[PDB]
Amino acid sequence: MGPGFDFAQAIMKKNTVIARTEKGEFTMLGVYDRVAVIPTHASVGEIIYINDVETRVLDACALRDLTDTNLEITIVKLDRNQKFRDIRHFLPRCEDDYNDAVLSVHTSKFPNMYIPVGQVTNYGFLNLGGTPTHRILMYNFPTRAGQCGGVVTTTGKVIGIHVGGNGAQGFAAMLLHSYFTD
Numbered sequence: 521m522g523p524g525f526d527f528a529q530a531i532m533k534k535n536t537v538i539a540r541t542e543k544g545e546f547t548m549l550g551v552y553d554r555v556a557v558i559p560t561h562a563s564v565g566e567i568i569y570i571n572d573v574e575t576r577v578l579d580a581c582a583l584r585d586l587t588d589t590n591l592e593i594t595i596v597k598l599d600r601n602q603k604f605r606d607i608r609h610f611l612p613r614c615e616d617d618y619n620d621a622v623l624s625v626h627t628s629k630f631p632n633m634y635i636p637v638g639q640v641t642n643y644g645f646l647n648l649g650g651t652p653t654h655r656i657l658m659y660n661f662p663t664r665a666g667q668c669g670g671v672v673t674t675t676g677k678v679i680g681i682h683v684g685g686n687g688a689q690g691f692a693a694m695l696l697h698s699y700f701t702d
């Protein structure tokens with residue numbers, strides 16, 4: 521509808537796949553080469569389905585901060601025959617607050633879904649499903665089941681992936697450039 525939705529669509533159309541684990545279907549953001557991200561509660565194993573194709577997992581790492589606190593981001597390297605467009609230059613370098621974000625989801629239940637969530641707060645600490653979690657972004661939208669893994673963007677930036685909600689607010693795990701250096 522406007523330039524926020526334009527940037528979101530450009531990310532969705534080239535840098536997402538549908539990931540299926542034994543815990544459900546998730547929006548999955550591809551970042552570069554065969555490297556993608558998914559919420560850690562997806563419980564990635566040795567095999568995952570990517571757009572309904574059986575795919576070997578070459579590596580999976582559940583990220584934690586240097587205090588050994590959950591970040592709710594798992595970085596997955598896929599045994600896929602195709603690379604993702606490299607979008608690492610759209611990742612923020614530091615923790616920040618944002619204006620005017622979009623949450624974008626693509627699954628069997630919610631294809632081509634875009635939500636203007638408005639202002640994004642650097643919330644920090646969240647007890648997420650009973651797990652102490654750091655680097656949480658918060659937005660005042662009543663997000664629902666089916667949205668985990670959804671991509672949070674501003675114009676110019678890919679800032680997080682949706683990991684939860686409390687019925688009135690939604691919560692995303694930050695993406696930082698430093699997670700994807702090699």
Ligand SMILES: CN1CCN(C(=O)[C@H]2CCCO2)CC1
Pocket residue numbers: 527530531
């Ligand atoms: C023609 N304009 C310049 C190229 N753009 C991009 O690279 C998109 C894709 C990912 C997010 O931004 C924007 C459109």
